[PDB]
Amino acid sequence: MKTEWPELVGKSVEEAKKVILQDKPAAQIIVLPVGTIVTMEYRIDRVALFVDRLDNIAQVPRVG
Amino acid sequence: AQSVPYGVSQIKAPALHSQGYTGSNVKVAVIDSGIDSSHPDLKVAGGASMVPSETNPFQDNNSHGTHVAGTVAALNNSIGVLGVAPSASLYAVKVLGADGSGQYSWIINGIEWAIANNMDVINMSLGGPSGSAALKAAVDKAVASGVVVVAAAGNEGTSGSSSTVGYPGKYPSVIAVGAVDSSNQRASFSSVGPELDVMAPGVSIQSTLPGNKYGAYNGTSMASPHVAGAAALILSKHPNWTNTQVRSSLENTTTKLGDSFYYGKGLINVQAAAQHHHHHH
Ligand SMILES: [Ca+2]
Ligand code: NA
């Protein structure tokens, strides 16, 4: 079971969503700016995507 | 009938309650997504919002801050859950929007508000992978000012021999808290490293949710308020103890678990912390 996507760093947010939804179709995806502070709860159903100001992935996506 | 979530029992908070100490007159800022002040199992004493587009700190559009608040201080009554420090003066310092995220300057503004309003304890169930000089300066100033500052260690799990504790937990002035389950086993997501200080329950933690609901959440976010609530119990029993002393009392009386890289000093034990003489059990 895949829970991290290091190969998506540097890709567009659009390609990242498509790939994550192929691997985990029930994923609850949220897009946030990289370099913010966020809640520290753990949700097995969630994949947060952290993007730079150009909307490319700037941190390894993972479940949580 | 009220229920006592297992984690409140596991850190031995009921021993303090039976001695008569419940966090009365101790001011605790939950620096987070707000707190739903309409919940009948919470009493919110005050607060402020640093989120430019969400100006009401007593409206929690995410749910996270309300859950964290209930672990700190859900009321002692015949409903819902019981908090670690059910008489604490609870302050909603909203620095995260509905989406669970905040700018560094918003978190810093909240820490500054807490200092200016004489908070005794700050809980920050929040984090990010990078620090900043201004963030470190804010937490250091709060600690220099006498505030006990507690944060989630992060949910990054393991990465070989590398530390995965996030900020502000990773700063020396902040107590970084990892998560265990009811068997005292580290949760697989709990961050690791030499900055991990103590552990507290962070798996399947029942607490208050907005709109008069309850539910079980997971995370180092859930572990952190057990320690912030414990700090408030300790201060209610020893109101002249400094933050330095409160911090040492929690660190020095943990139940040691595994290696410190994974478990820090072990599970907090607030009964032992609130005695005069401290040792590990
Ligand atoms: Ca209650
Ligand atoms: Na720290």
TrEMBL record, chain A:
Gene Ontology BP, a term: response to wounding
One GO molecular-function entry: serine-type endopeptidase inhibitor activity
Keywords: Protease inhibitor, Serine protease inhibitor
UniProt KW Repeat keyword: no
Role of this protein: Inhibits both subtilisin and chymotrypsin.
Family to which this protein belongs: Belongs to the protease inhibitor I13 (potato type I serine protease inhibitor) family.
Protein name, UniProt field: Chymotrypsin inhibitor 2
Source organism of this protein record: Hordeum vulgare (Barley)
Lineage, top ranks: Eukaryota, Viridiplantae, Streptophyta, Embryophyta, Tracheophyta
Full-protein interval shown: 22 to 84 of 84
